[PDB]
C-alpha cells in the first residue's frame, strides 16, 4: 500500500515569485519538497514525496497594471506518506499544519479539507492521481544542452532543481546555526513541463523528493 494525503484548492497570497536571479513565477519543486519536509519535521508524519499542481496563478502586474516579484495562486497538493493509524488523525494533523504553513513566503488563506487516498497497485495509483483534478502538475524533462538553448529550442521552462556548493563558509559569525555544514551556493536548474494530472501516464514522474548532489527529482525519473 502507498498512502497519499491530498489537499485541494490551496489559496496562497503574497508568494515570492523570484526563485532565482533568472526565474520568476511558479515556486520550484524545492519549495514544495521543503514544505513536505517541514510538515514531517513538525508533525512527525513521514513524507516520502510530493506532487503539486497549478489551479490558478498570477504574478502581480502581469495581467493588469497597478520590487520583489510577488504573485498569488491556487494549488493542489498531494503528499505521499507512511501512516499506520486511522485516516482522521492524519487529516487533522495535516490540516493544523497547512493552516499555518507558508509557500515561498506566501500566506495560505484557504483550502479544502485534506483527504486520504490509498493505492494497492499501479492501477489504483490512477484513482489517486485523478483525485487531484483539476490541476496542472510539474514533470521533469531534463536538460539537453543548457537552460537557455533548451528554453529557445525545446520551448520548455527552466526551474530550480537544487544547488551547487561553491565554498564552505569558514567563519560562522552571522550564521544562525553554527554546527550544520554551511556553504555558499548557487541555483542549479532543470527543464520542466506542465501536464493535467489526469494525462500523466505514470504518477511517479510527478512525485518530487530530495536526492543526491543537493537536488530534487521525481521518483520515476524523466517524463515519457
Amino acid at each position: 500500500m502507498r498512502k497519499f494525503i491530498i489537499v485541494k484548492n490551496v489559496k496562497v497570497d503574497g508568494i515570492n515569485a523570484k526563485s532565482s536571479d533568472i526565474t520568476v513565477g511558479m515556486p520550484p519543486a524545492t519549495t514544495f519538497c521543503g514544505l513536505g519536509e517541514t510538515m514531517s519535521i513538525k508533525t512527525g508524519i513521514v513524507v516520502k514525496a510530493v506532487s503539486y499542481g497549478s489551479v490558478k496563478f498570477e504574478v502581480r502586474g502581469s495581467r493588469f497594471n497597478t520590487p520583489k516579484p510577488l504573485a498569488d495562486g491556487v494549488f493542489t497538493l498531494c503528499f505521499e506518506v507512511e501512516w499506520e493509524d486511522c485516516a482522521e488523525v492524519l487529516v487533522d494533523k495535516v490540516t493544523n499544519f497547512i493552516n499555518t504553513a507558508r509557500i515561498a513566503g506566501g500566506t495560505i488563506a484557504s483550502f479544502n479539507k485534506p483527504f486520504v487516498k490509498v493505492a494497492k497497485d499501479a492501477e489504483e495509483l490512477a484513482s489517486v492521481k485523478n483525485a487531484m483534478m483539476p490541476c496542472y502538475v510539474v514533470v521533469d524533462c531534463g536538460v539537453e544542452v543548457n537552460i537557455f538553448e533548451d528554453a529557445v529550442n525545446r520551448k520548455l521552462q527552466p526551474m530550480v532543481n537544487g544547488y551547487k556548493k561553491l565554498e564552505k563558509i569558514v567563519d560562522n559569525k552571522h550564521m544562525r546555526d553554527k554546527f550544520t555544514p554551511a556553504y555558499l551556493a548557487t541555483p542549479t536548474y532543470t527543464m520542466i513541463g506542465y501536464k493535467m494530472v489526469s494525462n500523466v501516464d505514470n504518477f511517479d514522474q510527478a512525485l518530487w523528493q530530495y536526492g543526491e548532489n543537493t537536488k530534487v527529482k521525481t521518483i520515476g525519473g524523466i517524463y515519457n
Binding site: 536571479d21 533568472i22 511558479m26 563558509i169 554551511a182 530530495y210
Partner: protein, 176 residues
C-alpha cells in the same frame, strides 16, 4: 593598453568574480571566483568603488573589454602573454560575506546542509545577451543596483536596461 586598464583596476578595489550575493542585496559584497566555470565564452563580473574605471579610445572600461570577443578567457589562458595573465588572475580573489543573504536548510543523507545562495554573473550577462540575440520574449526584466547601480557592480552599472528572467508562469484551470 589593456595592461594599463588592468593595472588601474588593481590600483583600486579591483575584484573579478563569477558569483556574488550583491545581485540579491545591494549592501552584500560577497564575491566568488569559480575556476571550474571558466570557459571560452564565460561572462565575468567586476567590482570597484563607484565602478571607477579608466576608459579606452572608444570609451570602454575594463569590464566592457574583458567581456568582448572572448578577451577574458584569452588573457586568462595566457594567449596574450604571462604578464597580463598574472595581473588579471591576481584580481580573481574570493570575499566571504553572508549578511543580508538567505540561509536555508537543504536535506542531505539523513541530515541537512545550510545553503547561502548567491547569483551567477554568466547567467545574467550571457543569458540576457543570448535571449536578446535569439529573440526570446517569454520573459520578465529586472534591474539590479537599486537606487545606485554605479556602486553595485560593473555589469549593473553598464547594463541599465535590466537583465532578463524566464517567465515561469504555469497554465491555469479555466473558470467555465
Amino acid at each position: 593598453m589593456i595592461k594599463e586598464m588592468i593595472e588601474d583596476f588593481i590600483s583600486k578595489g579591483g575584484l573579478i568574480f563569477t558569483h556574488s550575493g550583491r545581485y540579491t542585496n545591494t549592501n552584500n559584497s560577497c564575491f566568488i571566483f569559480n575556476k571550474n566555470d571558466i570557459g571560452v565564452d564565460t561572462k565575468v563580473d567586476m567590482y570597484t568603488p563607484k565602478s571607477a574605471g579608466i576608459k579606452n579610445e572608444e570609451g570602454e572600461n575594463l569590464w566592457q573589454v574583458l567581456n568582448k570577443a572572448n578577451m577574458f578567457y584569452r588573457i586568462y589562458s595566457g594567449e596574450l602573454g604571462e604578464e597580463l595573465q598574472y595581473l588579471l588572475k591576481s584580481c580573481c580573489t574570493a570575499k566571504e560575506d553572508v549578511t543580508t543573504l538567505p540561509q536555508i536548510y537543504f536535506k542531505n543523507g539523513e541530515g541537512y546542509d545550510i545553503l547561502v545562495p548567491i547569483g551567477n554573473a554568466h547567467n545574467l550577462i550571457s543569458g540576457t545577451e543570448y535571449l536578446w540575440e535569439h529573440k526570446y520574449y517569454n520573459t520578465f526584466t529586472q534591474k539590479l543596483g537599486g537606487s545606485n547601480p554605479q556602486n553595485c557592480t560593473h555589469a549593473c552599472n553598464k547594463m541599465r536596461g535590466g537583465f532578463k528572467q524566464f517567465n515561469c508562469t504555469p497554465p491555469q484551470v479555466e473558470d467555465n
